[PDB]
Amino acid sequence: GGVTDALSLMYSTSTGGPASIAANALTDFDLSGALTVNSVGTGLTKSAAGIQLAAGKSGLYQITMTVKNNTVTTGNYLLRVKYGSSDFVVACPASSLTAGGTISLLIYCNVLGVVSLDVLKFSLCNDGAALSNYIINITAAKIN
Amino acid sequence: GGVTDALSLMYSTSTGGPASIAANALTDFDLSGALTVNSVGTGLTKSAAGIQLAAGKSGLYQITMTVKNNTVTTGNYLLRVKYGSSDFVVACPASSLTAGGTISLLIYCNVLGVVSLDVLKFSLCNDGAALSNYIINITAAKIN
């Protein structure tokens, strides 16, 4: 029961994020300064590159990244998660009622045992405006 | 193997939902009358407020809410899930082929032991028309 490894982070201008996330561009997030909301095991850890997967941790991972930036209600929020040669994306139309976006994924991750390569990379933006009032949550859990 | 708590519901005009979900607005759903499709354990239960998390159930939760309302193929379906001070959203462009939307999340939930506060709240609508022919499925499972 439960999972062997998991990491949940809260990313904001106050907790490790850029003072302003540029519009219409996807630059991977430095998560070293992110606030750890919950941590399980030691297989998943935050770093300047994203979320590191410890050696020997190949398997299935459930990942979710969400964002709310209530002061930006136009354009589309673009979200992206990368691991190795794979990248996953989604675009979420903004509105006052939905001032943000969400991306969730269940994927298989092969861990080579090379720290700089075995890392989940995260990024998002709004295609029409910079974000400087965002609350981003990133959670990853090894389910097998 | 398996999860300790889970709840899967089917929400419609015949099973607890409003006769008509207003357009372009997000009013949290009363799930007391929702049809229970599957239930595991007793940590997650349906209520007029949404889905209650029993005391002592802090942890990671996988959540999914989907909707199909085939007679509304225009505008954007707006979906929202809330827990405590956090809210998660997504907008899904409608079409005849995709007359609805989907929102899935893996999040950490802190349970304070205050029933009225420890509740997952759900809501959705179409930003251009009311929904009165919808099939909404909401499933939550505690994975850690």
Place this chain on the structure above:
Amino acid sequence: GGVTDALSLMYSTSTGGPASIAANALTDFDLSGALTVNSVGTGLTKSAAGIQLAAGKSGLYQITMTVKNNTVTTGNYLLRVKYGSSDFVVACPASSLTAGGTISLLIYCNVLGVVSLDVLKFSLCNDGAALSNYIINITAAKIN
């Protein structure tokens, strides 16, 4: 710890997919030729119909289907997953930064013990152009 059954596939023109996925239409995918990236247990297997659920495997399933087709950056990527009488959809606006889409679901699956009926069906397209340079990943795991 871990899941009892899971299947992760990589679908492309080189690994079982159509030479060209027609625009604005959703025809279920023949996954018999998909590349198996990871397999756990024997409850979930690829077939010409989609992903078969073995008899006695009723329960909760976490499903994700993603697509990247970098040469198609316009219109909306439409994704759909079906099981029995239920269908789940999402539309994802394309862009150069998000040339694809994502759909993830946690749903309850009742297995009748009728192979042709107990199958997860998958489909996607772009509503404005055919796809002939796609990398589609489909992963399903029985979590309870």
